[PDB]
C-alpha cells in the first residue's frame, strides 16, 4: 500500500494476572466517512494468540489470510509444537520490515496479545518493523489518549485482575469515543487466558453529555 | 509519500579500560513526542567477550542485531571458533556497507575485550566507516556526553593533572554522571540507564534509574 | 570573480585588486579599477554584484567627502568603516540591499594604519591582512604562513606577489594584472601594476 | 542449451577427449620454436604447398599483440578461435594494467581457456 | 542554518557574589575563518555585560542599537540600568522584529548596580527571556555546552572556582564544534573588579 | 507544554508544567507558564513563547487601563475579546494558544483561545503538546461542582499525565487557584522530577586552565 | 579534511589531518586518513570516510590477488586504474571519494589522484579535501622536486597545519608518511596544538 | 460540522451538531454553533471557527447599531445581507459557510444560506457543513411543504442524527432553537434523546 | 456513478444509474453498469470504466473455468473472493469500487462490497460510487430488516433517484436487476418512471 | 572548460588541446594530454565529463588496436570515426551514455588528411577545421577569417597560435599551455607545446 483506503483507528491492550485483553472498535473509515460500521479488527490467531490491527483494513485482511493459513499448515503436522505468541510477533516483525524494505508497506499498526506457559505476552509491530513489548499498548490516537491512563493505573498497581483490566479498557474506549473523530461506539474486547481466546461484542460505552449545559 | 525511516531515540556509550570494557545505554524508546516503552535497552550481547550498542531507527536496530547473530553462528560453524571483537567489527563494517544506497539507520558502538584481554571500543557510522577508540558516545545525547569524556578521560584542556589509568570504579561513576546530565537536557534520554561491564570473568549488568519526564 | 587583498604593516596598508571585468566567458576590460578614494588617507575596495558595487561605493564616497566639507576635517578610517557598515546593515533587510564585499584601508594620524573587512551581510572585522573572492581561498594561507605584524613595505610587496603568482599557477580564472596602492601618513600612493 | 558432459574420466584416470585432442595435434603440420640469445624463431611445415594457394591466407604464425606471437599445430579452425580470444585479452590487459602482457601472462590465459574446455558441459 | 553561517558560542554562569561570561573568538564564513579576535561580549555597565552568538552582522547591530537605547535610558533616568531591566529592554528590541528577526540569541550576565546580587539570563531571537540560577548557553554547540555545564556547575562557587568551571565548560564544548573556537575570552564580574582573560586554546 | 484548566464549585483551577524546549533539547526546566492578566484573571500559555509572553503582557496592560478607567474589577469576557480580536487580526501568525480563567461579578469563567482567534467557553480545557494526555484525565475523572481540593488533585493529575507521556513537557506542576475570596498562585505545586546525584567531583583547582592574557580592572 | 601528497627526488610524501565531522559536530579527531593499502602503496581519505575505506580495502584485496597470480607487485598506474574502474560504475549514485594513490614501482615514485567523479590523473603534487585550497597555497610556494628529506617533511607538515587553521572541517593531528623505494614509513604524528606552539 | 434550518408558518427551526475538530482530534465535543445575532435572528456556523466567530461578532455589532438607529426590530434579510457583504468581500480570506435564520414582523420566518464564496439565497430549508453531504437524499425525500413547528424540530433532529453517524467531523449533541414572534426556545438532545437508526447487522 | 445492492429472503436486488462522464461531458448516458459474471452472479461497477470492465472480464473467465471444473454453480462468495484477490493485488494500478451480488444454492442471496483498496465485506445492503455520499442518510433511515423483493426494488429505485438528482456524475436511467433461484429479471426505469421528489420551492 | 582545435591542410591535420585538468576553482594538473593515439595515423581528442572521457576514448582505442591485430591492417580515419559514432549513438539512449565531445584527426594513404567533429549526441561532421569548448566561441571566427584549403603547415601553426593568443587575451579561464601534434603520411609528430 502506498495510499491507505478503508482504515481502522486505535487498538488497545493490557496485561493482567493470567492473561491479556485487547480492544478495538468495529469501524472502517474512508477518510472522514464512517463507512463500514460492523467489521472486526481482531483475529484469533491460535489458542494462545490474538491480534488487533489499526490502519488499512485490506492489508489487515491479507495478513489474516496469510497468518490463518500458516496456523492451519502447522496444525496439519500434529507434531506437538505450536507457534507461541512471541513467535507470531517475531514473524510479523519480519514480514512488516521486509515489506517496508521493498518500499511497499502493509499499512498497519498491530497489537499481539497472548498467554503461554504461565506468561502474558503483549507486543507491538508497526508498518516499518518497529516492534517491542510492554505491559500495555495503544496504537493511533490511543497512544495519546489511552496510554497515559493505562500507564498511570499500572504505576499504582502493576498487577491487575482480569476484571480490573477489563474495566480500565472500557474507560479508555469511552475516552477515545469522546475525543477521536474516527472512532465509533461499537467495539469488541478479546481476552486470552489459559482457556484460550474469547472475542466479545458488539459492545458500547455509556456516555455522559452533562457538559453540554455547562458552557456558562 | 511513505518514509521507510523514523527516529526512535537512544543514547549509547562505550569505554575501554586496561582489562574491561563498558557498554551503556538508556532504555527509552521514543517516536515523535511519545514514549513507546520505558524498558527497551540498546545493548546486545554478541559473545562472552563482546557487546554492541545500537541506536537510531528501531526497525533497523532489530533487523541488524538479528543479522549479526546469524553471522556469528555461521562463522563459528565454518571456522570452529567464536568471532573475536575485532573480526565482529570488520564484519559489521561490510554488513553496513552492503546497504550503502539504502542504509541501516543505526549508530553502532562495539565494546569488548581484544585478544590480549584488553578493553576495546569500535565506533561506526551508518554505512560502516569505523575505528578503534578509547571511549565513544553515540546517539541522541552524544554531543552532550562526548565533551565531558574528552575532558575527564582524555584529560583534555587540563594542566598540572597526572594522566592515571582509568579504574573501573571511576569509569562507572563517569558513565552514571554523563547519563544523568544528558537526561536533564535531551528529551529522548531517560527512564533508566543499563550498564554492561565486560571483563575476563564475563558480562555483568547494572541498572540505574533516570528521570521519567 | 574578483580578487581583493590587503596587508597592514606597522605604518602602512597595502592593497591590491585584479583589473578584470568579466562577463560570461569573456574579459570585457583588462584595466578595471576596484578601488575608490574616500579621502586623502582612505581607500574602499568593492566587489560583488554589478550595479550594486559602484552604486554603493560611490554613495559612501560622496557622503565621506560631504562630511569633510561640512566639518572641515575628515572621518577617521574606523569612523568611515562603521559608517559603511551602518549603511550596508540598514539596507540588508530593506527593499534595496547591496550585494557587495569590501575592504576598507586607511591611515589615521593618531591610530596608524587600519584594514577592515566586510561581507555583504555587513559583518565588520579589523584584520592585519584579508582577502575577498575565490582567489582568497588560495592566498590566505600564504599570508598566514609568511606574514608578520612588522613586515616592511618592500617585503610586503613580495608577499603580495607570492599571492598573485599563486593565482597564476593554481586558480582556474585568467587574472593577469593587478592594481596596487599603499597608504601611509603621506596619503595614497599608486604603485606599478603587477602583471603577468 | 546443450549440457552433455563431453570430457569425463575413464577407468585408468584417463580423459579420453583430451587424449583425442592431442591426437589431432599430432596430425597437424610440424611447428618448431627456438629461443635464441636476443632472438626467438618460429618455423612451421606449410601444410601443402598447392601452387594455386594464396599463401598470405593460411599462415600458421600469428601476432597476438606487438610483442607476442604464436604458432600452433592441430585443427586450424580451433586455433583461429583461440588466437582471436587471446588477441581480445591482450587489449583488455593493456586497457586495465597500461602495460603490454608478458609472454607468460598470455600463455597462462590461453592455457586456462583450454583447461576450461576440458571441464565444461557441452563442449 | 542561518544561525550556523558564522558559528560561535557564548555562555554565562552564576557564582556566590559573582558572575562569569565567556565566548569564542572566531569570525568565520561557513568553513573559512576570517579573524580570530572577534568581539561577542559587550559592556552594558560597569558590572553588566551582554554576549551575543549568531549571525555576526546582527551580533554587531543588536549590540550597537542596544547601546543607543541604554545610553538614552541612563541619561534620562540618571541611574545605571538593573540587570532585569536590561533583559526587558533587549526583549522589546528583539520582539519589534518578530516578523523579520535579528539572528542572535543573547546572554546577559551581571551584578545589580545597587545590591550586587548576581544575575544571568538568555533570550531567543524574538525576545523570549529565560532567567536561571546556574548557567545559560547560546550558539552552534549548545548541546556540548549543556553537557559540560550540567556536569561541572555547582552552587555558590568562589571567583577562582567559577573561572575554572566556565573555562573548562567552554574549552571542551567548543573543541567538539567545527565552527566555534579559535580562542576563548572570559570575564569574571565581581563587586570591586572585572577580571578579563583569554585562554590557551586549540586553533583548529 | 501541558496546560489545563477546570471550573470547580467556587472558582477556577489552572495548571501548567514548567519545561521549555528548543528543538528536542530542554532550554528551561522552570519556565512560568501561568501569566497574570489581572488580580482576578490568569492565563496559561502554550505555543510560541515570545508570543504568549508579549500577548498576555499587552492584554494585561490594556485591561489595567480599562479597570483604572472603570473603577471596576475586569471581566473574563473582556480579556477573551481583546485576545481573540488581536489574534484574529494577525491571522494565526501570533502563535499564542491560551487557557484563560478568572472570576468576575458574574462568577467563574474558563476559555480556550487559539492562535487564529477562535475561542471556546468550557468547563475544562487543555492545550499544548501534552494536551491529549491531560484531556484523557479530565474525560475520565472530571465531575461538575468539584470541591477545591478535588479540583486541584484533578488538574495536577492532568498536568502529570502530560509531563510523563509527552516529550515536550516536564519538570514541575504549577497551579493557580482563583475564587471570589482568594488567589493561590502555587509555583511549584509539585516537583515530580529531580536531577540524579553527581557521583564524581570535577572541582578544578586554580591553574588547571592555562591562561594567555589577563587584565584586572578595579571598580568603585 | 585536508590531505596532500607530492613526488620528489626521494619518493613521495603523504600527509593528512585527522578530523571527521557530522554537520558542524566534530565526530572524531583521531581518524587515520592515510590508508595503508599494502607495504608499497598508500591511499588517502577525503570525501566519504566509508567510501574511501571500503573501496581502498577492496583495492588492497585485488592488489594481493594480483601479486599471487602474477608473482610481482602491481604498478601504481595499474593499482590506481583498478580503483578508478571500480568506482566508475557507481557514478551518479552518491559515492564521495577523493584519494591519492602513492607508491614507487619500475617507473619510480608514483602519484595518482582518483575520485568518485571518474577522474584519474598522474601528477607531481596534489591536495584533496575541504582544506585543499589552503594546503595548495603553502605547498605550492615551498615545493621543489629537489627538496631534502627533512625539508619535504617540514613542508607537508606546515601545509596541513595551515589548512587546519583556516578550514573549520580540518584539524586534530598531522600524520605524515614517506614512500621510499623499499616501502613506506610512518614519519610522524603531531597534534596541531603542539605544532601551534612550535610555528 | 452539520448545520440546518427550516421554515414554518410563524418561525424557524435551527440546529447543529457540537463537534469541533483539529485534524481528527475533537477539541470541543459540546460546541455551540448557533449564535444569536439579535433578539430573533441566529446564525448557524460552519467552516473555520475563528472566521465564523469573527464575522458573527462583527455583524452583531453592525446590526445592533442599525437597529438602535432605526428604532425597529431588524429584518432577517438585513442580517443575511450583512453576512453576505462581509463573506463576499473577504471571500479570499475566509472559510465560512453560514445559515442565517430568524423571524421579523414584516416577512415572518426566514432562512438564508450564505455559503462559501458569499452568495446569498433564501430557502425553505438549508443544510451545510461537512456532514450535509450525507443528508441531501434524506432531506430531499423527507421534506414536506406545510410542516408544523413540532414536525420541523423532529425533521432537523433526524437529519442531524443521520449526518452525525456518518461524518467523522460531526457529532456530540444536537443543539436546536425555534424562533417565532413569541421568542427563542433552545434545547439540547443528548445521548438517548438523539434519534437512533439501527446499524444494518447480519 | 451510483450503485447499490440489497439482500432479501431468496435473492438480491441490484441497481445503478447510467451516466459515464469524462470530466463533465457525458460520454454515455445509457451505460449498463450491472455486469453478469455468471448465471446468478452480477457485479455493479464504479470507478474507472477501463479498470472495472477489464477486471469483470477476467473474473468471468476465472469463475467460468472454475465452475466447469467443479461441475457446480459457483458460490457468490467465490466470485467476490476472485474480485477481491485481483482488486487487492493490483490496488496501486486500479480505480475500482465493486459490489458483487447474487444467489447460490448454498448461501442464498448475498451482497459483497469490494471497495477501492480491495477489502471485502458481506453486507445486508451496499452502496457505492460518487453519488453514494448523498444517500447514506436516506438508506440508513429507510432500510428495514425483512424487506420483500418488491419493497427492495422500490428502495433501490428511490435511493438511486435521490443520488442522481444531486450528483453531477450520476444520472440518466435506473437499471435494476433481481436475482433469485428462478433467474435474473432486468428492467429500466426511465423518464417519468424514475421516482420524483419535488424541489422545495418557496411558499 | 577544455579546448580542442583541429586544422586540415592539403596533406596534414594539425591538432591542439589545452593541458589543464581543473576541479572547482583549481587547476590540478598543467601537463594533461587530451589526445589518444588510435593507430599510426589517427588521433582521437576527447573532452567532457570526468570518467566518461577516458573510459570512452580508451574503449575506442583498444577496439581500433584489436581490429589491427585481427586483420593485419588499420582502420581508415573515416571508418574509425564511424565506429566511434556508432558506439556513442548506440549508448545515447542506454543506461550508460557517455558525455564526451570529440575530434578525430587522421591521414589515409589513399584519401589524405581528414578531420571529424563529434558532439555528445553523436552527430558526426567532417570539417576543414573545428573546435570544441567555450574557447571555440572565441576562435572559430579567426579560423573562418584566415583559413584557406591550401594552408601550409608553417602558416597553420601561426593560425593556431593566433587562436591560442586570443584565448589568453579574451577568455576568462586560465589556459596557459597547449599540446600540439600533426599527422601526415609519415605518422603522428609531436610539436613543441605552445605556452604562455
Ligand atoms: Cl460493515
Ligand atoms: Cl478471528
Ligand atoms: Cl599498454
Ligand atoms: Cl534601534
Ligand atoms: Cl467573546
Ligand atoms: Cl506546546
Ligand atoms: Cl591521528
Ligand atoms: Cl588479478
Ligand atoms: Cl595522467
Ligand atoms: Cl573532505
Ligand atoms: Cl616549510
Ligand atoms: Cl465554534
Ligand atoms: Cl459552504
Ligand atoms: Cl455551508
Ligand atoms: Cl464544516
Ligand atoms: Cl463530538
Ligand atoms: Cl446520463
Ligand atoms: Cl470505493
Ligand atoms: Cl464504491
Ligand atoms: Cl464513481
Ligand atoms: K530526558
Ligand atoms: K460522527
Ligand atoms: K445528476
Ligand atoms: Mg515529558
Ligand atoms: Mg538588488
Ligand atoms: Mg571548535
Ligand atoms: Mg580547522
Ligand atoms: Mg484566516
Ligand atoms: Mg489504469
Ligand atoms: Mg553517466
Swiss-Prot record, chain A:
Induction: Up-regulated in fibrolamellar carcinomas. Keywords: Acetylation, Cytoplasm, Disease variant, Host-virus interaction, Nucleus, Phosphoprotein, Proteasome. GO terms for biological process: negative regulation of inflammatory response to antigenic stimulus; proteasome-mediated ubiquitin-dependent protein catabolic process. It is found in: Cytoplasm; Nucleus. Transmembrane segments: none annotated. The keyword Acetylation applies. The modification Phosphotyrosine is found at residue 57. This is Proteasome subunit beta type-4. It comes from Homo sapiens. The lineage of its organism: Eukaryota, Metazoa, Chordata, Craniata, Vertebrata. The chain holds residues 46 to 261 of 264 of the full protein.
Curated annotation (Swiss-Prot), chain F:
One of its GO terms (biological process) is proteasome-mediated ubiquitin-dependent protein catabolic process. It is found in: Cytoplasm; Nucleus. Expressed at a low level in colonic mucosa. Up-regulated in colorectal cancer tissues. The keyword Cytoplasm applies. One of its GO terms (molecular function) is threonine-type endopeptidase activity. Its EC number is 3.4.25.1. Keywords: Cytoplasm, Host-virus interaction, Hydrolase, Nucleus, Protease, Proteasome, Threonine protease, Zymogen. It catalyses: Cleavage of peptide bonds with very broad specificity. It comes from the Eukaryota. One of its GO terms (cellular component) is proteasome core complex, beta-subunit complex. The active site is at 1 (nucleophile). The 26S proteasome consists of a 20S proteasome core and two 19S regulatory subunits. The 20S proteasome core is a barrel-shaped complex made of 28 subunits that are arranged in four stacked rings. The two outer rings are each formed by seven alpha subunits, and the two inner rings are formed by seven beta subunits. The proteolytic activity is exerted by three beta-subunits PSMB5, PSMB6 and PSMB7. Component of the 20S core proteasome complex involved in the proteolytic degradation of most intracellular proteins. This complex plays numerous essential roles within the cell by associating with different regulatory particles. Associated with two 19S regulatory particles, forms the 26S proteasome and thus participates in the ATP-dependent degradation of ubiquitinated proteins. It comes from Homo sapiens. The gene is PSMB7.
UniProtKB/Swiss-Prot annotation, chain H:
One of its GO terms (biological process) is proteasome-mediated ubiquitin-dependent protein catabolic process. It is found in: Cytoplasm; Nucleus. One of its GO terms (molecular function) is cadherin binding. Keywords: Acetylation, Cytoplasm, Host-virus interaction, Hydrolase, Nucleus, Phosphoprotein, Protease, Proteasome, Threonine protease, Zymogen. The modification Phosphothreonine is found at residue 35. Induction: Down-regulated by IFNG/IFN-gamma (at protein level). Up-regulated in anaplastic thyroid cancer cell lines. It catalyses: Cleavage of peptide bonds with very broad specificity. Its EC number is 3.4.25.1. The keyword Ribosomal protein does not apply. GO terms for cellular component: cytoplasm; cytosol; extracellular exosome; mitochondrion; nucleoplasm; nucleus; proteasome complex; proteasome core complex. The active site is at 1 (nucleophile). Component of the 20S core proteasome complex involved in the proteolytic degradation of most intracellular proteins. This complex plays numerous essential roles within the cell by associating with different regulatory particles. Associated with two 19S regulatory particles, forms the 26S proteasome and thus participates in the ATP-dependent degradation of ubiquitinated proteins. This is Proteasome subunit beta type-6. The chain holds residues 35 to 236 of 239 of the full protein.
Swiss-Prot record, chain I:
Its EC number is 3.4.25.1. Keywords: Acetylation, Cytoplasm, Host-virus interaction, Hydrolase, Nucleus, Phosphoprotein, Protease, Proteasome, Threonine protease, Zymogen. It is an enzyme of class 3 (hydrolase). This is Proteasome subunit beta type-6. It is found in: Cytoplasm; Nucleus. Its main location: cytoplasm. The modification Phosphothreonine is found at residue 35. It comes from the Eukaryota. Induction: Down-regulated by IFNG/IFN-gamma (at protein level). Up-regulated in anaplastic thyroid cancer cell lines. The lineage of its organism: Eukaryota, Metazoa, Chordata, Craniata, Vertebrata. It catalyses: Cleavage of peptide bonds with very broad specificity. It comes from Homo sapiens (Human). The active site is at residue 1. GO terms for cellular component: cytoplasm; cytosol; extracellular exosome; mitochondrion; nucleoplasm; nucleus; proteasome complex; proteasome core complex. Coiled coil: none annotated. The keyword Acetylation applies. Belongs to the peptidase T1B family. GO terms for biological process: proteasome-mediated ubiquitin-dependent protein catabolic process. One of its GO terms (molecular function) is endopeptidase activity. Component of the 20S core proteasome complex involved in the proteolytic degradation of most intracellular proteins. This complex plays numerous essential roles within the cell by associating with different regulatory particles. Associated with two 19S regulatory particles, forms the 26S proteasome and thus participates in the ATP-dependent degradation of ubiquitinated proteins.
Amino acid at each position: 500500500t502506498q495510499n491507505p483506503m478503508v482504515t481502522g483507528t486505535s487498538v488497545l491492550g493490557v496485561k493482567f494476572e493470567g492473561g491479556v485483553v485487547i480492544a478495538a472498535d468495529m469501524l472502517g473509515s474512508y477518510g472522514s466517512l464512517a463507512r463500514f460500521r460492523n467489521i472486526s479488527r481482531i483475529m484469533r490467531v491460535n489458542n494462545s494468540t490474538m491480534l488487533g490491527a489499526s490502519g488499512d483494513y485490506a492489508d489487515f485482511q491479507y495478513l489474516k489470510q496469510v497468518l490463518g493459513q500458516m496456523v492451519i499448515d502447522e496444525e496439519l503436522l500434529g507434531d506437538g509444537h505450536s507457534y507461541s505468541p512471541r513467535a507470531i510477533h517475531s514473524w510479523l516483525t519480519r514480514a512488516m520490515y521486509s515489506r517496508r524494505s521493498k518500499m511497499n508497506p502493509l499499512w498497519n499498526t498491530m497489537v499481539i496479545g497472548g498467554y503461554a506457559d504461565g506468561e502474558s505476552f503483549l507486543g507491538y509491530v508497526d508498518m516499518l518493523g518497529v516492534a517491542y513489548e510492554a505491559p500495555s499498548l495503544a496504537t493511533g490516537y490511543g497512544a495519546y489518549l489511552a496510554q497515559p491512563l493505562l500507564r498511570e493505573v499500572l504505576e499504582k498497581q502493576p498487577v491487575l485482575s482480569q476484571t480490573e483490566a477489563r474495566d480500565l479498557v472500557e474507560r479508555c474506549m469511552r475516552v477515545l469515543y469522546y475525543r477521536d473523530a474516527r472512532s465509533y461506539n461499537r467495539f469488541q474486547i478479546a481476552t486470552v487466558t489459559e482457556k484460550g481466546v474469547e472475542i466479545e461484542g458488539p459492545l458500547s460505552t455509556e456516555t455522559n453529555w452533562d457538559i453540554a449545559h455547562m458552557i456558562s | 509519500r511513505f518514509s521507510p525511516y523514523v527516529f526512535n531515540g537512544g543514547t549509547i556509550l562505550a569505554i575501554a579500560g586496561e582489562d574491561f570494557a563498558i557498554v551503556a545505554s538508556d532504555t527509552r524508546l521514543s517516536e515523535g513526542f511519545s514514549i513507546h516503552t520505558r524498558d527497551s535497552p540498546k545493548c546486545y550481547k554478541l559473545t562472552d567477550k563482546t557487546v554492541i550498542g545500537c541506536s537510531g531507527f528501531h526497525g533497523d536496530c532489530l533487523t541488524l542485531t538479528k543479522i549479526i547473530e546469524a553471522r556469528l553462528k555461521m562463522y563459528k560453524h565454518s571456522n570452529n571458533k567464536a568471532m573475536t571483537t575485532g573480526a565482529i567489527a570488520a564484519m559489521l563494517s561490510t554488513i553496513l556497507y552492503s546497504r550503502r544506497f539504502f542504509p541501516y539507520y543505526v549508530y553502532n558502538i562495539i565494546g569488548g575485550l581484544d585478544e590480549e584481554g584488553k578493553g576495546a571500543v569500535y565506533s561506526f557510522d551508518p554505512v560502516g566507516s569505523y575505528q578503534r577508540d578509547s571511549f565513544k558516545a553515540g546517539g541522541s545525547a552524544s554531543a552532550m556526553l562526548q565533551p565531558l569524556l574528552d575532558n575527564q578521560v582524555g584529560f583534555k584542556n587540563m594542566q598540572n593533572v597526572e594522566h592515571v589509568p582509568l579504574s573501573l570504579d571511576r569509569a562507572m561513576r563517569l558513565v552514571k554522571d554523563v547519563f544523568i546530565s544528558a537526561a536533564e537536557r535531551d528529551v529522548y534520554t531517560g527512564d533508566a540507564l543499563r550498564i554492561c561491564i565486560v571483563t575476563k570473568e564475563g558480562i555483568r549488568e547494572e541498572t540505574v534509574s533516570l528521570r521519567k519526564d | 570573480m574578483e580578487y581583493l587583498i590587503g596587508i597592514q604593516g606597522p605604518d602602512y596598508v597595502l592593497v591590491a585588486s585584479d583589473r578584470v571585468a568579466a562577463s560570461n566567458i569573456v574579459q570585457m576590460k583588462d584595466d578595471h579599477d576596484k578601488m575608490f578614494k574616500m579621502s586623502e588617507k582612505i581607500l574602499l575596495l568593492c566587489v560583488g554584484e554589478a550595479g550594486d558595487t559602484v552604486q554603493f561605493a560611490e554613495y559612501i564616497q560622496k557622503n565621506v567627502q560631504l562630511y569633510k566639507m561640512r566639518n572641515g576635517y575628515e572621518l577617521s578610517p574606523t569612523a568611515a568603516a562603521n559608517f559603511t557598515r551602518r549603511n550596508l546593515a540598514d539596507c540588508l533587510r530593506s527593499r534595496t540591499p547591496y550585494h557587495v564585499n569590501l575592504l576598507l584601508a586607511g591611515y589615521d594620524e593618531h591610530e596608524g594604519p587600519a584594514l577592515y573587512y566586510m561581507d555583504y551581510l555587513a559583518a565588520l572585522a579589523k584584520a592585519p591582512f584579508a582577502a575577498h573572492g575565490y582567489g582568497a581561498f588560495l592566498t590566505l594561507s600564504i599570508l598566514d604562513r609568511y606574514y608578520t605584524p612588522t613586515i616592511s613595505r618592500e617585503r610586503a610587496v613580495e608577499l603580495l606577489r607570492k599571492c598573485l603568482e599563486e593565482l597564476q599557477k593554481r586558480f582556474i580564472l585568467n587574472l593577469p594584472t593587478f592594481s596596487v596602492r599603499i597608504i601611509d601618513k603621506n596619503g595614497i600612493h599608486d604603485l606599478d601594476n603587477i602583471s603577468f | 542449451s546443450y549440457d552433455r558432459a563431453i570430457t569425463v574420466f575413464s577407468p585408468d584416470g584417463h580423459l579420453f577427449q583430451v587424449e583425442y585432442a592431442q591426437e589431432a595435434v599430432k596430425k597437424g603440420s610440424t611447428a618448431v620454436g627456438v629461443r635464441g640469445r636476443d632472438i626467438v624463431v618460429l618455423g612451421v611445415e606449410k601444410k601443402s604447398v598447392a601452387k594455386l594457394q594464396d599463401e598470405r591466407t593460411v599462415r600458421k604464425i600469428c601476432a597476438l599483440d606487438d610483442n607476442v606471437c604464436m604458432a600452433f599445430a592441430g585443427l586450424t579452425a580451433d586455433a583461429r578461435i583461440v588466437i582471436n580470444r587471446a588477441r581480445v585479452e591482450c587489449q583488455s590487459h593493456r586497457l586495465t594494467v597500461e602495460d603490454p602482457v608478458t609472454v607468460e601472462y598470455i600463455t597462462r590465459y590461453i592455457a586456462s581457456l583450454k583447461q576450461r574446455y576440458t571441464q565444461s558441459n557441452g563442449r | 542554518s542561518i544561525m550556523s553561517y558564522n558559528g560561535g558560542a557564548v555562555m554565562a554562569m552564576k557564582g556566590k557574589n559573582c558572575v562569569a561570561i565567556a565566548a569564542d573568538r572566531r569570525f568565520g564564513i561557513q568553513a573559512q575563518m576570517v579573524t580570530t579576535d572577534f568581539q561577542k561580549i559587550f559592556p552594558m555597565g560597569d558590572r553588566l555585560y551582554i554576549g551575543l552568538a549568531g549571525l555576526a552582522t546582527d551580533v554587531q547591530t543588536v549590540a550597537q542599537r542596544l547601546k543607543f537605547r541604554l545610553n538614552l535610558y541612563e541619561l534620562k533616568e540618571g541611574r545605571q540600568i538593573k540587570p532585569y531591566t536590561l533583559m526587558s529592554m533587549v526583549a522589546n528590541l528583539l520582539y519589534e522584529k518578530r516578523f523579520g528577526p535579528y539572528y542572535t540569541e543573547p546572554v546577559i550576565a551581571g551584578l545589580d548596580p545597587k545590591t550586587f546580587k548576581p544575575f544571568i539570563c538568555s533570550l531567543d531571537l524574538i525576545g523570549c527571556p529565560m532567567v536561571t540560577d546556574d548557567f545559560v548557553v547560546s550558539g552552534t554547540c549548545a548541546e556540548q555546552m549543556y553537557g559540560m555545564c550540567e556536569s561541572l556547575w555547582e552552587p555558590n562557587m568562589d571567583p577562582d572556582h567559577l573561572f575554572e568551571t566556565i573555562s573548562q565548560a567552554m574549552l571542551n564544548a567548543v573543541d567538539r564544534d567545527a565552527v566555534s573556537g579559535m580562542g576563548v575570552i572570559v570575564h569574571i564580574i565581581e563587586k570591586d573588579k572585572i577580571t578579563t582573560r583569554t585562554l590557551k586554546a586549540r586553533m583548529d | 507544554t501541558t496546560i489545563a484548566g477546570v471550573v470547580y464549585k467556587d472558582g477556577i483551577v489552572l495548571g501548567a508544567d514548567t519545561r521549555a524546549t528548543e528543538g528536542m533539547v530542554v532550554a528551561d526546566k522552570n519556565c512560568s507558564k501561568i501569566h497574570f492578566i489581572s488580580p482576578n484573571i490568569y492565563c496559561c500559555g502554550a505555543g510560541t513563547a515570545a508570543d504568549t509572553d508579549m500577548t498576555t503582557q499587552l492584554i494585561s496592560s490594556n485591561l489595567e487601563l480599562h479597570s483604572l478607567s472603570t473603577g471596576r474589577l475586569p471581566r473574563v469576557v473582556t480579556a477573551n475579546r481583546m485576545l481573540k480580536q488581536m489574534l484574529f487580526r494577525y491571522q494565526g501568525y501570533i502563535g499564542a494558544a491560551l487557557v484563560l480563567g478568572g472570576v468576575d461579578v458574574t462568577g467563574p469563567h474558563l476559555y480556550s483561545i487559539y492562535p487564529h482567534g477562535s475561542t471556546d467557553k468550557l468547563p475544562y480545557v487543555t492545550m499544548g503538546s501534552g494536551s491529549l494526555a491531560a484531556m484523557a484525565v479530565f474525560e475520565d475523572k472530571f465531575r461538575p461542582d468539584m470541591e477545591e481540593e478535588e479540583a486541584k488533585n484533578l488538574v495536577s493529575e492532568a498536568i502529570a499525565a502530560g509531563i510523563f507521556n509527552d516529550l515536550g513537557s516536564g519538570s514541575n506542576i504549577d497551579l493557580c487557584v482563583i475564587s471570589k475570596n482568594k488567589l493561590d498562585f502555587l509555583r511549584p505545586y509539585t516537583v515530580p522530577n529531580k536531577k540524579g546525584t553527581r557521583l564524581g567531583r570535577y572541582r578544578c583547582e586554580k591553574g588547571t586552565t592555562a591562561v594567555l592574557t589577563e587584565k584586572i580592572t578595579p571598580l568603585e | 579534511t585536508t590531505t596532500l601528497a607530492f613526488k620528489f627526488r626521494h619518493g613521495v610524501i603523504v600527509a593528512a589531518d585527522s578530523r571527521a565531522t557530522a554537520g558542524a559536530y566534530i565526530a572524531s579527531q583521531t581518524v587515520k586518513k592515510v590508508i595503508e593499502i599494502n607495504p608499497y602503496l598508500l591511499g588517502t581519505m577525503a570525501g566519504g570516510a566509508a567510501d574511501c575505506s571500503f573501496w581502498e580495502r577492496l583495492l588492497a584485496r585485488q592488489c594481493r590477488i594480483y601479486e599471487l597470480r602474477n608473482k610481482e607487485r602491481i604498478s601504481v598506474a595499474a593499482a590506481s586504474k583498478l580503483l578508478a574502474n571500480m568506482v566508475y560504475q557507481y557514478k551518479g549514485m552518491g559515492l564521495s571519494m577523493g584519494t591519492m594513490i602513492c607508491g614507487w614501482d619500475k617507473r619510480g615514485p608514483g602519484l595518482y589522484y582518483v575520485d568518485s567523479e571518474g577522474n584519474r590523473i598522474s601528477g607531481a603534487t596534489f591536495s584533496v579535501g575541504s582544506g585543499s585550497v589552503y594546503a595548495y597555497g603553502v605547498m605550492d610556494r615551498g615545493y621543489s622536486y629537489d627538496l631534502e628529506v627533512e625539508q619535504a617533511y617540514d613542508l607537508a607538515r606546515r601545509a596541513i597545519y595551515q589548512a587546519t587553521y583556516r578550514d573549520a572541517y580540518s584539524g586534530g593531528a598531522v600524520n605524515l608518511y614517506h614512500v621510499r623505494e623499499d616501502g613506506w614509513i610512518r614519519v610522524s604524528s603531531d597534534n596541531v596544538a603542539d605544532l601551534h606552539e612550535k610555528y | 460540522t452539520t448545520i440546518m434550518a427550516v421554515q414554518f408558518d410563524g418561525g424557524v427551526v435551527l440546529g447543529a451538531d457540537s463537534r469541533t475538530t483539529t485534524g481528527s482530534y475533537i477539541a470541543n465535543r459540546v460546541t455551540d454553533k448557533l449564535t444569536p445575532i439579535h433578539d430573533r435572528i441566529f446564525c448557524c456556523r460552519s467552516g473555520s471557527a475563528a472566521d465564523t466567530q469573527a464575522v458573527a461578532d462583527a455583524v452583531t455589532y453592525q446590526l445592533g447599531f442599525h437597529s438602535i438607529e432605526l428604532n425597529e426590530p431588524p429584518l432577517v434579510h438585513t442580517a443575511a445581507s450583512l453576512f453576505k457583504e462581509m463573506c463576499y468581500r473577504y471571500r479570499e480570506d475566509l472559510m465560512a459557510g453560514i445559515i442565517i435564520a430568524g423571524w421579523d414582523p414584516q416577512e415572518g420566518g426566514q432562512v438564508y444560506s450564505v455559503p462559501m464564496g458569499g452568495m446569498m439565497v433564501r430557502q425553505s430549508f438549508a443544510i451545510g457543513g461537512s456532514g450535509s453531504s450525507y443528508i441531501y437524499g434524506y432531506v430531499d425525500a423527507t421534506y414536506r411543504e406545510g410542516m408544523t413547528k413540532e414536525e420541523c424540530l423532529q425533521f432537523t433532529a433526524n437529519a442531524l442524527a443521520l449526518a452525525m453517524e456518518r461524518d467523522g467531523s460531526s457529532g456530540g449533541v444536537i443543539r436546536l432553537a425555534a424562533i417565532a414572534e413569541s421568542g427563542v426556545e433552545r434545547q439540547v438532545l443528548l445521548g438517548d434523546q438523539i434519534p437512533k437508526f439501527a446499524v444494518a447487522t447480519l
